[PDB]
Every structure is written in structure tokens, then in C-alpha cells.
């Protein structure tokens, strides 16, 4: 098929000439007649675009290498002694035991109960009699 013009053109952003391989295989095919080397380049036109909407996203943070500021300082003094030699005595992995990191979170609970009853006694009194 061919869409009117010819070209089923689609989305666009930028362009690059592909390359990664040049030394490969051995040598054995047809014959000697070496001449197919003559390239060309050129560009002079720009067209419009039809992409304009607004959808909604789902808010959540992002992890990676992290460093930054706050604005705070204070100090101490005590201890001080040194003797080592880079060899492999305390060259090993571990890091951390257990910690907090309890900054903030949004907890959503849900639970329901109606339930009812009725029950009552009655007051039954006794008759009295008097005489002269």
C-alpha cells in the first residue's frame, strides 16, 4: 500500500545516524571493481505539530544517589589515636543494624458496626390492707 503521497510518517523528536560496527568477518565474495563511495547531506524545512492535552498523575517520590542541605552546626571533643597499614585485616562488608526513617506516611483505616437491642423489666407492686 501507499498512503496518498507515499509516506506513512508518524511521531517525531530528533534523529541520529546509526553506527557501532565496522571491523567484522573475513574477505570472499564477487570480484574487483572498487567504487561506491560518494555520500551527500542537506536539510531546509520545518513543519507544525498537533499535540495538546492535560491528563493526571499519581504522586510518589523517587530514589537514587541522594545528598543536600538543611542549615545547622555544633561540635564536640574527646578520643584520638591512630596506627594502621592498608593490607586486609578490616577490609570487609556489613553496614547498618536497624533504624527509624519514620518521617511521614498517610494511613487509611476502615471499619463499621451498627448493632442494637432492647430489653426492659416491669415494676409489679403488692396490695396493702389496713383495719381499725
Amino acid at each position: 500500500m501507499a498512503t496518498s503521497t507515499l509516506i506513512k510518517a508518524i511521531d517525531g523528536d530528533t534523529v541520529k545516524l546509526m553506527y557501532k560496527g565496522q571491523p567484522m568477518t573475513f574477505r570472499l565474495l564477487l570480484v574487483d571493481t572498487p567504487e561506491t563511495k560518494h555520500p551527500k547531506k542537506g536539510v531546509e524545512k520545518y513543519g507544525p505539530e498537533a499535540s495538546a492535552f492535560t491528563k493526571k498523575m499519581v504522586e510518589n517520590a523517587k530514589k537514587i544517589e541522594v545528598e543536600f542541605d538543611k542549615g545547622q552546626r555544633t561540635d564536640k571533643y574527646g578520643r584520638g589515636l591512630a596506627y594502621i597499614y592498608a593490607d586486609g585485616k578490616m577490609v570487609n562488608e556489613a553496614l547498618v543494624r536497624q533504624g527509624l526513617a519514620k518521617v511521614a506516611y498517610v494511613y487509611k483505616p476502615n471499619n463499621t458496626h451498627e448493632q442494637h437491642l432492647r430489653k426492659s423489666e416491669a415494676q409489679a407492686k403488692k396490695e396493702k390492707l389496713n383495719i381499725w
Binding site: 500500500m1 501507499a2 498512503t3 503521497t5 507515499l6 509516506i7 506513512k8 510518517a9 508518524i10 511521531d11 517525531g12 523528536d13 530528533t14 534523529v15 541520529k16 545516524l17 546509526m18 553506527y19 557501532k20 560496527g21 565496522q22 567484522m24 568477518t25 573475513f26 574477505r27 570472499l28 565474495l29 564477487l30 570480484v31 574487483d32 571493481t33 572498487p34 567504487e35 561506491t36 563511495k37 560518494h38 555520500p39 551527500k40 547531506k41 542537506g42 536539510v43 531546509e44 524545512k45 520545518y46 513543519g47 507544525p48 505539530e49 499535540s51 495538546a52 492535552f53 492535560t54 498523575m57 499519581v58 504522586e59 510518589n60 517520590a61 523517587k62 537514587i64 544517589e65
Partner: protein, 624 residues
């Protein structure tokens, strides 16, 4: 009356499940066909091994395969006097067709039973097809020359098991009594067996004789009359050979059963006298990128077999070729190391290289649909062609097929030839858009410009097409037009910009100042121009990637060049910059601005100053 109402069959992957598609063949008799094809390769092994030990004949020189038939028990008995099969060739192969664990390469290490895919390509086809019409297949074989008591009994009714037992047979070769099902009497009727045998036996050199039994009172005359022409397909006259006898001979010599798209039966005499008969498969072999052969040519010297699947007669670029070659001049004592080292086989395979060229070029002009099948199976292989031989790259470029804008399909139906017919008046330049990914070819904006002016484009979207691009700078005296840059040719011509007018630029001026002082000296300059596209930010460059390749350019400061810091340009109208302009808040203002920055840098470098600056802002606007 029948009434073919509805259809539907879609199945791919795994050789065995693809075998079951043409197992039926609309014939059934494909079983007898393939059975004798193994008896031909048994006759081949025999005549090779006879060069090392003539005792194999056992005195009896009559090498033939005989088909006898019975109505009472309902048994079709095919018995050749070939090499037969040893205890090894039965247990270590027929057992590996049954339950063992060949899988696709091997169950355990993926190497030991690697060389069973070649063996299933031949014997595996005849196995299941036999059991389609046979209730029981009893194979009673014996290796020629080798001791009669090491003869092998084999029995199966089609289950994943085999009853193997050592028996005695003084007769050499293989004797297979297929107990056919009641109803399969056709393969036991004389006239039917005549037509069936001849159809394939004519491609076979080995005389396929039949039980012509006359069962008359007293005169029960058993005679064996050959139904085949009894002549090897390469040495007999091409006039006597029909097109199907070629297609059928392929299935034998390729250890396969598919229909070949085309072939080339040429004889060449002189100093190097050979008779060549090459073919083109309709399938991509399993072992195409494996260290074992599924390509190759069966070596015959002076009509005698030496070795099968010998890829030593064919360059690695021409690995798509399948067939054989009978050299009458080559040594009969020849081996695979002689074929790899000796100059005679180098000149011989180069003499076969041209037979490939004619066969492909013909198929290209004759039937481009069959050549399209070839190309989508063997494209990557022929892509090495223009990348090695750039001398004849124009000639190979006629064979080269690329995907183009002519369709939005990934089908490489359009040729450089097709494009020559598609060429516009004055067009000396074939427009190329290159990418190592199909979706990256479809990420090209230059397409819309070609769409408006009406000129055709190649969508290069393959891995090894970039290797041929190092050489394929011209075809047919016509250079290519590479989309390598967008340039300042449109400098003062930037008026055709939808509605990005001075009204917007009055509101841009505070935005310009804020962005230039936000970024500072990590960018050369932030210029607000009117590039439309779907890209909200794009950069301008002076020289080679601004200045990332030259002498003076690195003589500016040395470290990455200061000038190299690209000119940060934005589209005021595009919704990304427009939504960035809606946000005056510094935290999110810098979120958008520095995002669009490292986006544009990523376009003109592929690498960033800070990947994490970008990836924070990118994924954050996607998520929050």
C-alpha cells in the same frame, strides 16, 4: 460435495510442531518418500566407507532398495542394501527421536545431543509420517560388512518408546516391515505403489525396485523391476529433470522436507571440473547462528559420496545456500581439513560463489515474493554482502531490500530497485533515515517534511544495516541524503510557525532572563526561537557536535570545550514550555527548565553532565 466453511491455524516456534504442519502433506505417502530418502543417505555412507573397506558389499554388489507389499497381514516391507544401521545408529538416534531428551539442543548440558537437530531434519520426518498410516513400524537393520549377529531389531507402534533387541541377519542393509493400518491398502496396491515410488525415486541414484510378483497356479514368479529412472539428479539431463524432482532432491541432500524457492543446476568443466546443484530454502535453519552445520553442500567426488552438509564449498556470507557439488577433478581422498586449507577448494567455492549470484539475481527479478521469503529468513546473512564486497556493492544493492515509508509495516518489501522506479524528477539523492531500533526510526520528525513535499524515504531499522552504511554511501551513481543534522538554513525564514508571534515573545522576555541566569555558565546561551515539532527544547550547534571534534575547538579551554555547552532553544507555544511558563514557582520552574535542558543535551550528546538531574525531573513530572 464437501463445503469448506471456516478455517484458522496459527502456530510458531519449536521445529517438531512446525514438522506436524506439513507432516500430512495432503498425500500421506510422504512416509515412503522420506523412508527411501534415508536409504539413499545409507547408500551414500556405504559407498564412502567402501573406499576404506570394500568388504561391506559381502560379495553382493547389487546396491538397491526393494519395496514388497502384502494384503493378508497388511505389511509394506522396504529393504535396502546400503550401510544399514549399527547398534549405535539405532539406539543413539532412533532412541533420541523417541523419549531420551534432545529437547531442541539437549535437556542437560545443551551440547552433547546438539547434532541430533540435523538427524531429526531427515529421519525424524519419516518417523512420525510412517506412523500416520502404519499401526506398527518394525525396523530390522544390519550394518554392511559388520558381523550379522550385531543386527538390530527395533519396534514401535508410535509411542515415546522403542523395543530394541540384537538379532542375526546375514543380509546387509536395512529391512523395515511397516504393518499398515487396515484401510491403508492403497500403499499395498501395485499401480498406486508405482506412481508413489517414481515421484521421488527418480531424484534418487539408488535403483528402487518393486516386488512384481505373479501369483498364478504353480507360477508364483517373484521379480524385482525398477520403477525409478535410476540416475543421480546432478549427472542426468536437465531436460529429463522436472522442477519437482529438484524440489524433492533438496529434501534428501539438505536433511529437510521444505519446498525450495529456487535452484541452480549448472555443470562447469575445464581445469576444475564439477557439476553443481544449489538450492534456496523457504525456511530459516535452527542452527543458522549455531556452531554446527544445518547449511552446507553434500560432497561427491566422481559420483561417489565423501561427506554431507560440507559448508567448506560455500563462504559464510552465502550460508543460506543448500545443495551439493560433485567435483570430478577434486581428490577422492579429500577431507574437511583439505577443504578448509587446500587452494583447489578455495577456487572451487569461489566458482560456486558466482552460481549463488546468478540464482539470487534471477529469483529477485523472477519472483520478488519468493525473494521476500528468502530475505526475511536470510536477510542478516546477505547484509554482510555489501559490507565485505563494497566493490560490487551496487550489484549487491539490487539484492538488498529495506523497510521504507512506502508503508508503516516492518516488511522489507521495497528495494533500491523499487525506489529507482519511485524516484522524482531531478532526484539524484535517495533519502535515508537510519536507526538500530524500529521505534527509533519512527521517532524521526524529518518524516513530516518528506510527507508534505512528496519524496520517498528508507526506514533503516536493523542491527547490521549500520555496518553496510560504512561503505553504502552511493548506489547507481546516486548519493544518499542523510538526515544527520537540522541546520540554520531556516535562520530568518522562521515565520511559518503556527501562531508563535511577537505577542508570545513579549511574555517570553522575563522568562528568557530568568532561565539564562538560572542556568548561568553551564549553558552557552538560551535563545527563544520558534521550532514547532513535539520536542519542547532543541539546541543549535556551530561545528562537529558544536565543538566536540576539532583542534581549535578543544584549544578553547581543553576540558569538554566551553563553546560545546549547547544553545538552549525552546518552543514558546508547545504545551511543555507553556505548562512550564504557567508555573512561576522557582522549585517547579527549575524542575521544567533544567529537565528540558538535559533533554536537549541528551539529543545532541546521548550522555549528560548530571543524568540524575534529568531523571529526577523526568520521572517526577511523570509520577507527581
Amino acid at each position: 460435495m464437501k463445503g469448506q466453511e471456516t478455517r484458522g491455524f496459527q502456530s510458531e516456534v519449536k521445529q517438531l510442531l512446525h514438522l506436524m504442519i506439513h507432516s500430512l502433506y495432503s498425500n500421506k505417502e510422504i512416509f515412503l518418500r522420506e523412508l527411501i530418502s534415508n536409504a539413499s543417505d545409507a547408500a551414500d555412507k556405504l559407498r564412502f566407507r567402501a573406499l576404506s573397506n570394500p568388504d561391506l558389499y559381502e560379495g553382493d554388489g547389487e546396491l538397491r532398495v526393494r519395496v514388497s507389499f502384502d494384503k493378508d497381514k497388511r505389511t509394506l516391507t522396504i529393504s535396502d542394501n546400503g550401510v544399514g544401521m549399527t547398534r549405535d545408529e539405532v539406539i543413539d538416534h532412533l532412541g533420541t527421536i523417541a523419549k531420551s531428551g534432545t529437547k531442541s539442543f539437549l535437556e542437560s548440558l545443551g551440547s552433547d545431543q546438539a547434532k541430533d537437530s540435523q538427524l531429526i531434519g531427515q529421519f525424524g520426518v519419516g518417523f512420525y509420517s510412517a506412523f500416520i498410516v502404519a499401526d506398527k513400524v518394525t525396523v530390522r537393520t544390519r550394518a554392511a560388512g559388520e558381523k550379522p549377529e550385531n543386527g538390530v531389531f527395533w519396534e514401535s507402534a508410535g509411542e515415546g518408546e522403542y523395543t530394541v533387541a540384537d538379532i542375526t541377519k546375514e543380509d546387509r542393509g536395512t529391512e523395515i516391515t511397516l504393518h499398515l493400518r487396515e484401510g491403508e491398502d492403497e500403499f499395498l496396491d501395485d499401480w498406486r505403489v508405482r506412481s508413489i515410488i517414481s515421484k521421488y525415486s527418480d531424484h534418487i541414484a539408488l535403483p528402487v525396485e518393486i516386488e512384481k510378483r505373479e501369483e498364478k497356479d504353480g507360477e508364483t514368479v517373484i521379480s524385482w523391476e525398477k520403477i525409478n529412472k535410476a540416475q543421480a539428479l546432478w549427472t542426468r539431463n536437465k531436460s529429463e529433470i522436472t522442477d519437482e524432482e529438484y524440489k524433492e532432491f533438496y529434501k534428501h541432500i539438505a536433511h529437510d522436507f521444505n519446498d525450495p524457492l529456487t535452484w541452480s543446476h549448472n555443470r562447469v568443466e575445464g581445469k576444475q571440473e564439477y557439476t553443481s546443484l544449489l538450492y534456496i530454502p523457504s525456511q530459516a535453519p535452527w542452527d543458522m547462528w549455531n556452531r554446527d552445520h544445518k547449511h552446507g553442500l553434500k560432497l561427491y567426488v566422481q559420483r561417489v559420496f565423501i561427506m554431507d552438509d560440507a559448508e567448506q564449498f560455500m563462504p559464510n556470507y552465502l550460508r543460506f545456500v543448500r545443495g551439493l557439488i560433485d567435483s570430478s577433478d577434486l581428490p577422492l581422498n579429500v577431507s574437511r581439513e583439505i577443504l578448509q586449507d587446500s587452494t583447489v577448494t578455495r577456487n572451487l567455492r569461489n566458482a560456486l560463489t558466482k552460481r549463488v549470484l546468478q540464482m539470487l539475481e534471477k529469483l529477485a527479478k523472477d519472483d520478488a515474493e519468493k525473494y521476500q521469503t528468502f530475505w526475511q529468513q536470510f536477510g542478516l546473512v546477505l547484509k554482510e554482502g555489501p559490507a565485505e564486497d563494497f566493490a560490487n556493492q551496487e550489484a549487491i544493492a539490487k539484492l538488498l531490500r529495506f523497510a521504507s515509508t512506502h508503508t508503516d509495516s516492518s516488511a522489507q518489501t521495497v528495494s533500491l530497485e523499487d525506489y529507482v522506479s519511485r524516484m522524482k524528477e531531478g532526484q539524484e539523492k535517495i533519502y535515508y533515515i537510519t536507526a538500530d531500533s524500529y521505534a527509533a526510526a519512527k521517532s524521526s520528525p524529518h518524516l513530516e517534511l518528506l510527507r508534505k513535499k512528496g519524496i520517498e524515504v528508507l526506514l533503516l531499522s536493523d542491527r547490521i544495516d549500520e555496518w553496510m552504511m560504512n561503505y553504502l554511501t552511493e548506489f547507481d551513481g546516486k548519493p544518499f541524503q542523510s538526515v544527520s543534522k537540522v541546520d540554520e538554513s531556516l535562520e530568518k525564514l522562521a515565520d511559518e510557525v503556527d501562531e508563535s508571534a511577537k505577542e508570545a515573545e513579549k511574555a517570553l522576555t522575563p522568562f528568557i532572563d530568568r532561565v539564562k541566569a538560572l542556568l548561568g555558565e553551564r549553558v552557552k546561551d538560551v535563545r527563544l526561537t520558534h521550532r514547532l515539532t513535539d520536542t519542547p527544547a532543541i539546541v543549535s550547534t556551530d561545528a562537529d557536535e558544536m565543538s566536540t571534534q576539532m583542534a581549535k575547538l578543544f584549544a578553547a579551554a581543553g576540558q569538554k570545550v566551553p563553546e560545546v555547552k549547547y544553545i538552549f532553544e525552546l518552543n514558546p507555544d508547545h504545551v511543555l514550555v507553556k505548562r512550564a511558563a504557567d508555573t512561576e514557582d522557582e522549585a517547579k520552574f527549575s524542575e521544567w527548565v533544567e529537565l528540558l535542558l538535559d533533554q536537549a543535551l541528551l539529543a545532541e550528546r546521548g550522555t549528560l553532565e548530571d543524568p540524575n538531574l534529568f531523571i529526577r525531573r523526568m520521572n517526577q513530572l511523570l509520577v507527581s
